[PDB]
Amino acid sequence: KLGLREIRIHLCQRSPGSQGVRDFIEKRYVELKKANPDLPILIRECSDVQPKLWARYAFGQEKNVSLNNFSADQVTRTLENVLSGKA
Amino acid sequence: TQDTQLIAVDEKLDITTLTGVPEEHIKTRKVRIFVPARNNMQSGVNNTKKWKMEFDTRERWENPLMGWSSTADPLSNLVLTFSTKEDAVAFAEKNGWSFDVEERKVPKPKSKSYGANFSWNKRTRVSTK
Amino acid sequence: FAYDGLKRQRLTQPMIRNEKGLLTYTTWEDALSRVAGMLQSFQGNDVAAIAGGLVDAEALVALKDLLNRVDSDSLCTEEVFPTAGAGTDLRSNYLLNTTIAGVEEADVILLVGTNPRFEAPLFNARIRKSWLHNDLKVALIGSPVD
Amino acid sequence: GTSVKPIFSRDMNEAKRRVRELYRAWYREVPNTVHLFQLDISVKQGRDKVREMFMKNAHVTDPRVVDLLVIKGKMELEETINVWKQRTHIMRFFHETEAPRPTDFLSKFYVGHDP
Amino acid sequence: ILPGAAYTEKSATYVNTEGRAQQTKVAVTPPGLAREDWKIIRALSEIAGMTLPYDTLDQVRSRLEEVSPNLVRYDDVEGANYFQQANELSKLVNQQLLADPLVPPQLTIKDFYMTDSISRASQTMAKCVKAVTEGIQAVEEPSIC
Amino acid sequence: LHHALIPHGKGGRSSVSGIVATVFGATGFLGRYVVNHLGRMGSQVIVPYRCEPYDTMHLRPMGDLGQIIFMEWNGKDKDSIRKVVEHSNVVINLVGREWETKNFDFEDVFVKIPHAIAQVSKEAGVEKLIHISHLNADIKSPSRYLRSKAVGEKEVRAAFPEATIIKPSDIFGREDRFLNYFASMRWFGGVPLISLGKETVKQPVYIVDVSKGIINAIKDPDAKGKTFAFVGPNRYLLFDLVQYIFAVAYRPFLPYPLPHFAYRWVGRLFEVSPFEPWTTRDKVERVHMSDMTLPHLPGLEDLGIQATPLELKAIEVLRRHRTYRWLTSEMEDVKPAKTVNI
Amino acid sequence: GVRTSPTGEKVTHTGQAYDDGDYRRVRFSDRQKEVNENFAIDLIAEQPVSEVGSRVISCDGGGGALGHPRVYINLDKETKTGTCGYCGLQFRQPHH
Amino acid sequence: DTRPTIRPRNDVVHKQLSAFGQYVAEILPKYVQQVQVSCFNELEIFIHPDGVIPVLTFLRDHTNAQFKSLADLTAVDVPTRQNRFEIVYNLLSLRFNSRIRVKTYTDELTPIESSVTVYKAANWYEREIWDMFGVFFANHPDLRRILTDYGFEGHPFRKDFPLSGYVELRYDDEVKRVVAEPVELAQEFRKFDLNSPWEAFPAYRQPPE
Numbered sequence A: 001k002l003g004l005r006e007i008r009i010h011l012c013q014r015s016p017g018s019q020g021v022r023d024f025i026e027k028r029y030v031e032l033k034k035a036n037p038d039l040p041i042l043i044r045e046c047s048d049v050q051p052k053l054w055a056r057y058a059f060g061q062e063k064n065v066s067l068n069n070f071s072a073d074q075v076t077r078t079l080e081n082v083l084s085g086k087a
Numbered sequence B: 001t002q003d004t005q006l007i008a009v010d011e012k013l014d015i016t017t018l019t020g021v022p023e024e025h026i027k028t029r030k031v032r033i034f035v036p037a038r039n040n041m042q043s044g045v046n047n048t049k050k051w052k053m054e055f056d057t058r059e060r061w062e063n064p065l066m067g068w069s070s071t072a073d074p075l076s077n078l079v080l081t082f083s084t085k086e087d088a089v090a091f092a093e094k095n096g097w098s099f100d101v102e103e104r105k106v107p108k109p110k111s112k113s114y115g116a117n118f119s120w121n122k123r124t125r126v127s128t129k
Numbered sequence C: 001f002a003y004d005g006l007k008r009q010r011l012t013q014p015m016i017r018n019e020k021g022l023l024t025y026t027t028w029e030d031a032l033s034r035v036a037g038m039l040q041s042f043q044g045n046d047v048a049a050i051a052g053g054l055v056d057a058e059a060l061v062a063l064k065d066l067l068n069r070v071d072s073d074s075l076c077t078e079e080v081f082p083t084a085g086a087g088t089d090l091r092s093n094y095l096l097n098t099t100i101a102g103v104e105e106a107d108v109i110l111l112v113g114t115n116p117r118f119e120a121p122l123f124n125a126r127i128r129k130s131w132l133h134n135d136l137k138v139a140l141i142g143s144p145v146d
Numbered sequence D: 001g002t003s004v005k006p007i008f009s010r011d012m013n014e015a016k017r018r019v020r021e022l023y024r025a026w027y028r029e030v031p032n033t034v035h036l037f038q039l040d041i042s043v044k045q046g047r048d049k050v051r052e053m054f055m056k057n058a059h060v061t062d063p064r065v066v067d068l069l070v071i072k073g074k075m076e077l078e079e080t081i082n083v084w085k086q087r088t089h090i091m092r093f094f095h096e097t098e099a100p101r102p103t104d105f106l107s108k109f110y111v112g113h114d115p
Numbered sequence E: 001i002l003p004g005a006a007y008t009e010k011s012a013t014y015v016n017t018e019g020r021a022q023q024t025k026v027a028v029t030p031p032g033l034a035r036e037d038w039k040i041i042r043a044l045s046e047i048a049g050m051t052l053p054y055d056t057l058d059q060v061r062s063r064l065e066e067v068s069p070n071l072v073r074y075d076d077v078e079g080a081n082y083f084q085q086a087n088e089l090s091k092l093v094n095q096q097l098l099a100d101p102l103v104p105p106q107l108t109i110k111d112f113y114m115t116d117s118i119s120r121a122s123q124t125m126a127k128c129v130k131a132v133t134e135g136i137q138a139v140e141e142p143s144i145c
Numbered sequence F: 001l002h003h004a005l006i007p008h009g010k011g012g013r014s015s016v017s018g019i020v021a022t023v024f025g026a027t028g029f030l031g032r033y034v035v036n037h038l039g040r041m042g043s044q045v046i047v048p049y050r051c052e053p054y055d056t057m058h059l060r061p062m063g064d065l066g067q068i069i070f071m072e073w074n075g076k077d078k079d080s081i082r083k084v085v086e087h088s089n090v091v092i093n094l095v096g097r098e099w100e101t102k103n104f105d106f107e108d109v110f111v112k113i114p115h116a117i118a119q120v121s122k123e124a125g126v127e128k129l130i131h132i133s134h135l136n137a138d139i140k141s142p143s144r145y146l147r148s149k150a151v152g153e154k155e156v157r158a159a160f161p162e163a164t165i166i167k168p169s170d171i172f173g174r175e176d177r178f179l180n181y182f183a184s185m186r187w188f189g190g191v192p193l194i195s196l197g198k199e200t201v202k203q204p205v206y207i208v209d210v211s212k213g214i215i216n217a218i219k220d221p222d223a224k225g226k227t228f229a230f231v232g233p234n235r236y237l238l239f240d241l242v243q244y245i246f247a248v249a250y251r252p253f254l255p256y257p258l259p260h261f262a263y264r265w266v267g268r269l270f271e272v273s274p275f276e277p278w279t280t281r282d283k284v285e286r287v288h289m290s291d292m293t294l295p296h297l298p299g300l301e302d303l304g305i306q307a308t309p310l311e312l313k314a315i316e317v318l319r320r321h322r323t324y325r326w327l328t329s330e331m332e333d334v335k336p337a338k339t340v341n342i
Numbered sequence G: 001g002v003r004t005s006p007t008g009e010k011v012t013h014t015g016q017a018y019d020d021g022d023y024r025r026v027r028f029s030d031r032q033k034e035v036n037e038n039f040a041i042d043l044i045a046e047q048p049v050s051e052v053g054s055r056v057i058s059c060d061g062g063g064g065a066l067g068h069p070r071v072y073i074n075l076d077k078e079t080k081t082g083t084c085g086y087c088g089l090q091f092r093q094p095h096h
Numbered sequence H: 001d002t003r004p005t006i007r008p009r010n011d012v013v014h015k016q017l018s019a020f021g022q023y024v025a026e027i028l029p030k031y032v033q034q035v036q037v038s039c040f041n042e043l044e045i046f047i048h049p050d051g052v053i054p055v056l057t058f059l060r061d062h063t064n065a066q067f068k069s070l071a072d073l074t075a076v077d078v079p080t081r082q083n084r085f086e087i088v089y090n091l092l093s094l095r096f097n098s099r100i101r102v103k104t105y106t107d108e109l110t111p112i113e114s115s116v117t118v119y120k121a122a123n124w125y126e127r128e129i130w131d132m133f134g135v136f137f138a139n140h141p142d143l144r145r146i147l148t149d150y151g152f153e154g155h156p157f158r159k160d161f162p163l164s165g166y167v168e169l170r171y172d173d174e175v176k177r178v179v180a181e182p183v184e185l186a187q188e189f190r191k192f193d194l195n196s197p198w199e200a201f202p203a204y205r206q207p208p209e
């Protein structure tokens, strides 16, 4: 029942800590969307924001991992685990 | 700097317990720190120079006898004036008022040229004067 | 001048339907209990929401949270935006990226399927300001609206 | 400057000492207040009110604020002892006429717009 | 029917066409038993047993921050990037264009005045529509003082 | 709700409570407290009075400007009831008299006047009627007072079926005629009591509890058609109660067993007074009677009120009866009287 | 003129009268509602229009310093009358 | 004098007061921060709060000052200052037929020295300043409220204290006494924005930020 409803990716345009997620969105987000066409992947950038991934599951349950100073490979692993169980 | 028996104190000044303000009108109020906008009806700028502290407006109802505007908000008319934003935020903080302060909006400089009204090849030329 | 409408046709009290099928004033507790009873009997796609054009973000997020509590994701707006491709995922897909101040710096503007004069009067005023001083060039796809 | 001058107490322990002296004085005064003003309350009620008035300011950490609170408390005690206050003044600590205001979100939502 | 507050009766966040969040402040309170909208929804959630985790405007605004952080950056326009990602995602939908000409909903000024519920309840907007559609003698008023 | 009846403010004197109340019997003991509680929250109070207007002056500072309206009325005239009732959304019936007069007997004030008020209120379309009967009201009572109270309950429910009947026990307060009645027995030597008062058990209730309960019954949507018993928290044998009253007042307490027949003769002798009889046969009968227990009735705790004990509010009533010797004594110098329970 | 409400309440010159369900009418019971019966609009409507022979006329309300601030009224519109914005007196050019 | 409307300026008294201000500043450099003379010939001495007793005693006792009378002692609240309270001493010299103003400053938590030892008149003025502004005066013989009701909370003359305060009084018939309740106004005070958007006095124009 507790399937995944949506994910929110928060980041910053200039801060060096959001650079891995910026690279991930640049090179991997389009494939993630082609593989998950109905999943809301809401990418919201805001200045001086620590990178954070949100996952909203069934019945309003959300959990956020922190993506600060993540490499693009680490954000890819973090989204893979979220989107496929393990987390 | 002087013989006053300087005692170490924290830099979080809190005079809320001494102001005599009821507790409802400290935690639940929200003051606004701003430079008032210029009244668009006039072109005078002398009222947009100081910082203002205003409280959030509460309910005003109609008096059953005369139809007057009644209130139960003691701070409905309280308006403080400050020279800088920093003074206003310090005053709000030591009084324990939650605040939101907005940056002062000043007119941007503009390039005014009377001779543009008679331009040879620009749209700035006026059709009437 | 539309603040005149803020004094007319105003909703002032909670209303429910009487046994004759007509809207009648009632207490907040009664109406809210009716809605809550209907809320906790349906879930998922059985409960949905439509947001009008004058709704704040606080109410929007509150209603979204409430509908998510019953596992409903059908939180819609009246105004359609293309949800295909990126859809709403990228914020740049659905907003004025040049900003209102940015049309002054533009060399040429293209207007597609819009009447900015009545859709967004002050944005159109900025376009005319840049047309006047910056000699902005304007093109339009749509009706030859003035 | 970086530091400030004290009212009386150069430290928090001195402020606590004066607070305890004031609390002692108020606690001993309460029975005489109940008898003299012909209050319809009990001495336990009055001393619990004194304690609850003291407990409102328990969060204060500035020794100067504590000193001024002690000064105002001694002023109030002297108004009570010298019978400068009337019965109405002593009974104003107990808001007997004011109705119980709501506290939870729902009742406040029901009765009006105030947070 | 749940009577809510109009935009002049609440402190409320509105995001404009370029993306900057701005907040109103209440000028008056809602009339009668009308209430702030997020408070109506929070009360309904508590009555339903699904109480939302905010009892205050600051708390609902921090919730807004959790959902989309730009929604609390008042007066600031946050830049949004990845137009190229959106453009390469938009090329998979291969939908066609109708032959229908692009016609705006508002072609003349008479279509401007009456657009939302507040301006449909406005008698000034009605007078404006009447003056536009018929002429100058339609709406009359003695401006004699 | 009519637009002028929407509550506004914060529940203070200048607020609007949405209540428009006509308080019949507002110039009495119970009346001055419900009028005060209504004017506290900013209610529109209509005061029907038949007394000299000088006798209504204590009610004038009870509400904001315009919120207390005084109007002449005649208990034997339906037009006056209609006049004072037309614009109210709640009617409170508080008229009563512990003695019969040459113009108003118990049937008039407890049957005819309440039925007239209920029927006129129903016709005029007031949403709420609160009627104040007695706890001990009984169609086979030894008291004319209580028999008429039962008849009046019947008549009020017949005329106004949505009415809230409230049945208090012997209400005590600063001007109660219950604690002052027993404290006034020091003027005739000792305290005469039928069977020494060892067979009578009382459950008195505090006046502020009754008034707050009436207000809460007004505000409670589930009080229509309901009957409430407003009893106190403790039950007392009449001997123990009167002993405690005299101990608190500090007067010497020397009771003696006046029989029932001699006490009725005493009451008959007092009825001759044409100004507020000190006691009557009916009062003698109702004092000697025990309060009934009605566990099936909702009470002051079903309206959200904790009943105040006598041993908490008796000093504010009896400190006037103390001599100069004991005028400034604490409330706890007298231990609480023994309580009989169920 | 001063009219009557459907409830019988007298309607003032500002057009005020409580509706049939308004509890506030209880204030007038055993009393009266104070209404000034001289409606100024109907009174100024009764005054004639002066046929002054000029394009601009001046009006100070009569009585010189005891009237109102002196104002000048244009009388060029031949359909309307020029009326004083202080006291309501009307002026017009002779017979157009 | 062909200017019957303008107030006449008296330069002799201006010079005399200027010279005496220089004199006072020179004699007490330890406490005098600033001295100035108004256009209407009023001399003010701005001092450090520590110099209240020394400066006041000098002005009272010096044979060239002889300011024997304390005309007034009051406070002024200026919230935009960190030391919001401005303490004003108005002194009169009968011997030289002159007046002088002495001003210092304090905040909510710093005590000003009591000047009752200099002027016996200061006893009630300092109590009134404490009552209406909350300024503590150390070593005051009897400091307590003077003007406000017993048990009154707050200091009303502070600029952030509301005009009608927080509590009302009325007689309550249930409890048989006068009670205090949160203030409700049947007609709230109507705030007027009167200041003109145009500058009135160019000579007082503050330099731009």
Ligand SMILES: NC(=O)C1=CN([C@@H]2O[C@H](COP(=O)(O)OP(=O)(O)OC[C@H]3O[C@@H](n4cnc5c(N)ncnc54)[C@H](OP(=O)(O)O)[C@@H]3O)[C@@H](O)[C@H]2O)C=CC1
Pocket (backbone or CB within 6 Å): F024, F025, F026, F027, F028, F029, F030, F031, F049, F050, F051, F075, F093, F094, F095, F096, F097, F098, F104, F109, F132, F133, F134, F135, F167, F168, F169, F170, F171, F172, F176, F178
């Ligand atoms: N007090 C108690 O212990 C108990 C009281 N009750 C009931 O509570 C209600 C109020 O009691 P309480 O306030 O103590 O009584 P009071 O006798 O003190 O007041 C009675 C009220 O009724 C009015 N009244 C009495 N007779 C008439 C009449 N013939 N015509 C017009 N008005 C009349 C009085 O007006 P005026 O003063 O002008 O005569 C007065 O306003 C009564 O219904 C009573 O029976 C029930 C149980 C116990």
Ligand SMILES: [Zn+2]
Pocket (backbone or CB within 6 Å): G059, G060, G061, G068, G084, G085, G086, G087, G088, G089
């Ligand atoms: Zn005129």
